[PDB]
Symmetry: C5
Subunit: 395 residues, 5 copies
Amino acid sequence: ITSRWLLRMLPWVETKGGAYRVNRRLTFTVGDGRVEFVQDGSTVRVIPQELGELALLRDFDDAEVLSAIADRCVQRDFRAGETLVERGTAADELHLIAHGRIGQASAVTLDVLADGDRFGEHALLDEDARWSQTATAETSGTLLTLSRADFAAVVANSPALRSHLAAFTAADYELKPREYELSVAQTILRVHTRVADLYNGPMNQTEEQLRLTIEALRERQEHELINNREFGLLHNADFKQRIQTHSGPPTPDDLDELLCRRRGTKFFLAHPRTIAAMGREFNARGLYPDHTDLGGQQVPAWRGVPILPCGKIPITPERTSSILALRTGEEDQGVIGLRQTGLPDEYEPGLSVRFMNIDEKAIISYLVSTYYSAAILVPDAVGVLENVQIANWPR
Amino acid sequence: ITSRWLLRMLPWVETKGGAYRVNRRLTFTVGDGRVEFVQDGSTVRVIPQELGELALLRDFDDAEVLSAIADRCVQRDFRAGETLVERGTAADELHLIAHGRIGQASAVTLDVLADGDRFGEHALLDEDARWSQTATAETSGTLLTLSRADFAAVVANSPALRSHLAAFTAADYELKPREYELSVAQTILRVHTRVADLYNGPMNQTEEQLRLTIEALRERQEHELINNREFGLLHNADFKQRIQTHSGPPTPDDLDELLCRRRGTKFFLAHPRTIAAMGREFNARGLYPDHTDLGGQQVPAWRGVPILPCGKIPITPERTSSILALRTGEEDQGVIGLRQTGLPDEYEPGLSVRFMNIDEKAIISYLVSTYYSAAILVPDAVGVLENVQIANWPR
Amino acid sequence: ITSRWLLRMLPWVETKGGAYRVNRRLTFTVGDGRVEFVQDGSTVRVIPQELGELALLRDFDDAEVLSAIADRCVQRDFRAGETLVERGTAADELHLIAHGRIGQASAVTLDVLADGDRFGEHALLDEDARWSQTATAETSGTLLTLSRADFAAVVANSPALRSHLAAFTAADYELKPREYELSVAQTILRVHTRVADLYNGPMNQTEEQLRLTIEALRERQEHELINNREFGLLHNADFKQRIQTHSGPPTPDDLDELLCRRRGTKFFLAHPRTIAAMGREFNARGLYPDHTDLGGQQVPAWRGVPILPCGKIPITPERTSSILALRTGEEDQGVIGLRQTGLPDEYEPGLSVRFMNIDEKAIISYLVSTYYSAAILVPDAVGVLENVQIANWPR
Amino acid sequence: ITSRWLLRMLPWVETKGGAYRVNRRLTFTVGDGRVEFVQDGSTVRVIPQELGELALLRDFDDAEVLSAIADRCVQRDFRAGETLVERGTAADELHLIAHGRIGQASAVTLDVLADGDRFGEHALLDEDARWSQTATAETSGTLLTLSRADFAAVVANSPALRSHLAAFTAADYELKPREYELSVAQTILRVHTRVADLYNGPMNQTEEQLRLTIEALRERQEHELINNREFGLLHNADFKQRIQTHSGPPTPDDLDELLCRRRGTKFFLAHPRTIAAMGREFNARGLYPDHTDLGGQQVPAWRGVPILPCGKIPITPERTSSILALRTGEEDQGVIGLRQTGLPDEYEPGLSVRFMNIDEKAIISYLVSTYYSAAILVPDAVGVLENVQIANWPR
Amino acid sequence: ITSRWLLRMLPWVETKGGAYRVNRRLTFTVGDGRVEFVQDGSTVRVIPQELGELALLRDFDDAEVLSAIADRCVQRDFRAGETLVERGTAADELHLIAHGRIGQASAVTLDVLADGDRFGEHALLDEDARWSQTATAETSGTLLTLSRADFAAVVANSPALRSHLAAFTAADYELKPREYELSVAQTILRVHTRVADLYNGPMNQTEEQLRLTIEALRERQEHELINNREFGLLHNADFKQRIQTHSGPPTPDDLDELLCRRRGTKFFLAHPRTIAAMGREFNARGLYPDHTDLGGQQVPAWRGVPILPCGKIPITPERTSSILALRTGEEDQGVIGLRQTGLPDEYEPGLSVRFMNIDEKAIISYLVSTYYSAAILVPDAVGVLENVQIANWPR
Ligand SMILES: [Ca+2]
Ligand SMILES: [Ca+2]
Ligand SMILES: [Ca+2]
Ligand SMILES: [Ca+2]
Ligand SMILES: [Ca+2]
């Protein structure tokens, strides 16, 4: 029953056969100290060529072997404040950081590793390796793990790798298409036969129940478009596009930085609590931003970019939310809504209601279905500002 | 003779038979530590299922018994600074807080209870119970009271309750329609026959007196729409929608919070003194808000939402007022004005003037009547910011 | 030759017979500690019923006697810093404050009396009464005086008053119409016959002298509309509508307060020096108010209400001026300009130039006349902010 | 080649016979301690009646004598920091201050004399008079000087003056028209005959040289309109209209004061360096002024009054400039541009190019001439803010 | 694939024969202590007449000799922090500063030389000369060098110079046209014959590859227009138009100064990181600049001048960038884009794709060519703000 801004702002394109294909270019250079990954929503995997940045694997350029080694790592997720390794415990895993920041405290907090960093190199070769620093995850993120035993097995598999390891001991174009499959929001509406036979003259309680069902389906559509793992702007956004606040509250400097990272930003999406926090920051700074009109409707904006409320963005127990800056379009590579119309029996252009059966208890069943998905044409189309403290007040 | 903004901004819908029906959904979950209530204007009553949050009544799920227990509590109102219970006095009542904040000072101010809180649990079971804290009401509000004797009587009534109590000693959907009945503003206009016979050529003093009567009736309509107890935005507003100022003056952060709680806010209603206080806060913060045009009329606004003056909002002796943020509409669930037109003898579409009789003293009597009421379709349509200090000046 | 904003903004209505009638309602309640007065421009008189607030006259309700007592008081005006009574001097007068603030310093400045206050009660009864405080007028204002001898004479006149005094010793509706008489701005233009006979071909020096005469008459019209005593916005404004600045400079908080007191304010009138002071305050506060267009002409405004310069508002030697906030209209009760057109011989719709005579010295005389006045339909139509310090600069 | 704002904004009126007449009213009252002067550009002369403010000449009212005495004073100009008189030197001159401020330091800086002040009274009568204070000119200005010998000669001329002096020893209307004569910007363009015979097919180097000549003439026109002594806004502006900055940088308070002194100001003229300084002050104060559109062209403005750049306003070696606020028009008494069109041989409506002769060296000569002047109808049409420090930066 | 603002904002003019001619006037006066240079992109050369400011060459006015001496100097570039001369090392070179600032530290940092300064005079005459100060280049710039031996050779060449040197020992107009030659962006597109024979029905992969080639060519066009040495706004901008920030971050005062130096500025060009830094400065100052619409597109602006992002402006390792303020036009002397259309075989108005050959390996080759250049009609058309710190955050 709430306002659905993402549904009415994202353009909808018609897929054929319930599938879509997006061609991805992944530019990456070796030697720069950062490992680049391939991300498919929430599932991530290291680029096989990038894997060569590791010294113990430098100058090895057999595509088969690198691909196998890349395939044998395991993805793990860590929450804020969770301890991953502890000082004193023997080291047996190589950790490649894909997202988040992790502060390492030695026996003296050395520094904080971030996206593209590695720790655990020496643990791979010798069995005497011991963790001398404690890594505490300051921010939630992902991390790839390469076990010593698996790499040893791969070494015992390829003779070329043995010889290269024994000898050492003494812009790249990568095309890989991404396939999007239409997800379904489905439900069963059970209407008693009496309610369909009698209550049908001045208003249809069947039609009113169907409208309520459609509204619930649309709310689920928005919640999935925001929070789903395979597709979904919160999770299926490039790791480089996700920024951290300088101080924690959503100061206007953070909004300027969020607008810096991409061209032609269309709008901001944030929780209403987050919008209140941004307004508090604006009042503290003493500036009054203008409001712009979209569709004959006035809306708060920053630098002319409208800020739209979305209640489906989660609020963490620590009262920290996130802000999304995103451009929409097909001619300009942005975010599109994949949706198939022309269904066999449409109550609405995107909907399909079909009579299922009548039970022995005289209850008619209807199947209400809609098919939807989201596509991001280029990586630099959605930026996310994370860990935004929304419970800060002037003191 | 003053401007009537609420009369000209609230849409008016035609009721049939002088009555209206509003369907209410009351979502509530058990175990979360807050008791949810059903509010009909100023009269409040505890939800029978919510009553189960009490430990001494946990796991009892007989609808009849819970309904009876809920029916046997008494609603009481407390003003700011009034002491409800005192330390040392024996405890004999269970108090469930429906609105307001109450600070409890022990023998050391422990904390402040708020809406949905309970105190007086142990007073229900044993007669030795004694109040060890003094509860001072910092803000005016309501409170439900459950006496020990009444609960004991209910226990002596239901055998199932006795057995459950003896054993312990060792999202829910609730539909309940709300009915609105049209209220009447009526008056008698006494015009002497001489004034109707002679003073009728160039101007009608009868018609001028009728216009003055109509203006007085409209002023009474506004005062009732604001301050009435059964219906009326000040009292018939959800307890969750009523917020307290962070500091006491109406700072722009408070306005941002007031706009946060509901979607598509239409306008603000405040006393002109309150508007002056808000302007003083704006000048202190150094920001100059824009002004928007409604009906070809310029008006001060915040974030594009016009702020309309209403002199019918009371000012307390402590010089504290309240602000109302409210959206209006029928297609969008908001606040509507129930009014019946097509009266038997209409001087105006909503009015009815009828000749009553002529007295022995040659005085003609006229009956001027109008029928009006207010409906709030959804709970999240009117928000109230309370205890707004309007007598604060820079120092 | 200057811009005449009041002439071009005040609507002009046509009076019949050179007179106008305004019906006044004066609501007043007894017992509230303030005495209400009837004001006709600069002449003020106490309401006879209000006079009952005095204890020594409480419960006396003979209309004739109260009217007589009210008629026998004398109005006096006091300037800022003038001492009215001195400590030690015997008290013989009862003083009722109608306007201004007066600080009383005892043998220790007790407090400051204001509009509606009384001091000198006991001086009325006994002859031993002595002034024990010195009253210094901090602000210019008026004051009603009731002498002991006059009240004693009235007592000796009415037997009922004697009995009531001897016994004690042991919302009201009052209609009183106000009549406005059109004032005249007149002058005599003396043109030599030679100047009318010769200098008439390419330009008329007679017509140029007439235009200069008309401009002088219009300037006098504005000066009288502002500064006249009988009519005139500066003096014929309600004592409750006149406010004092919180600090002395015209801070924007003062403008907000000035806009608070009345509905639908049309514009502000202030001296250009006052406008410069307001701009200095705006710059100090750091806010830049918008400008609005009236008649295709841009003008500075506050909260959308245009601020118009008027050089006829006096500047005191202490460099303190006043600001006027006023709404104009006839359908909305405000300030109207009474003016009669259709004169026997009109050079202009409101003007009348008539040949008088030719002197023996061959000098033609012309009489240039215009008739004008101002009416204030309701008391809450003109508000005045007084003692505005306009010579304050940042330091 | 630069933008010429004054040329395109000043209205141009056609004079007849190359001359214009402006009628001046000079209101002045005696006894107020200030001497009023008549200014014709840069040449100033004391009003004969005002001369009576001097005590030694009080009550003498012979028009011939006063006119003679007024005629026998000499005008002198002083720069900032220049010492005019020194302590110890015998006093022999009476100095009347027409413009600027001069600080006098005694044996202790007494005070600062300003426009309309006098010093050197006693030096006129006795020969023993000695300067006991040193007068240092803080600001550039003018000063009238009356020598003792000249006044003594005038005394020896008029018997009436002798008798009046011997006896003492024991609003006025003054019309005086101002005549404006059109100035000429002239030049000679020498084009070789070969350049006129050959280089004439695809483009005319003769026509290109003529366009360059016209541009140079227009630049000279602007420089004279700004900086000329007889006419010219910088010098031919009323001494009362010239203000001094409160602090030295062009703070917005100074702009408000500049707008205070005259009605209907059209625009500001300042050097681009001065505009940069004003922008720096605006940024320091934290306010962002709006921009207005004239002729479809956006331009910075203050209070809706556009600020136009003019590079012809001089910058002193001390990096101090001046700002001009001026209204333009003929129906509203302001600043007009006198210019005669319809010349015998016009290349442009205001221009005249005429063939002069061909030299023996086969060089054709052309005479390019334009006639222009400026008129100020009323004294209060141009205000000048002087000694504006434009080299101030935040520290 | 990024937005190309410079391509769509610069007007394009059609050159004839692939060449353009710009007539330059170089006004310079002798004796003012600054040497003026002639700049052709990145190549600079001293004006021969200006060379006379040197004392050892004063009063020598033989054009041939001065031209020869000017021709025999060598241009050198210095980076920030690079030491050019060291104390103690013998002096053998005369250094004329053309751009940048160089701080000289003696045995005590004396001062900082800047554009037009000279150091090394005495090194020219005697061989005993020794550097007594160390010159450290605080900012990158250019510098002309005149060796002692070369000047001695020129002296031994001209007898007149010997005599003038022996004797001493005891606004100018200079026209020099600038020629612009069109540069070419060329590439070869290799398409396999199979891809051209089969993949041609529903979409042409040949046409898609051609579009990608065109986009790459346009990106190279922008990068050359910004960063090229011969032409290019960053390098081919007048040395007087290049300003240094007062503090280092791009404060609004710096933008005001950048707008001060030229008339009718069209737009600003800066890196998106620089735009973020400017927004941070605006938020710190507390002012919110307006946004203007160009081509129906909203864009941030300062004082109404739009600020356009350009990613081709380099960012130094010290995180310092530059800002460009530039006006565009042909009728108003500014920056124009030289481009020739009407090519023999145009895929696009400015493009030319031509079939080259088919290789023995059945690979078709296409030649994609475009011709472009940039012209700056007057020196005061592009201003550059340099060393702008873009990594500054509030602390
Ligand atoms: Ca890499
Ligand atoms: Ca609950
Ligand atoms: Ca009273
Ligand atoms: Ca005088
Ligand atoms: Ca020079």
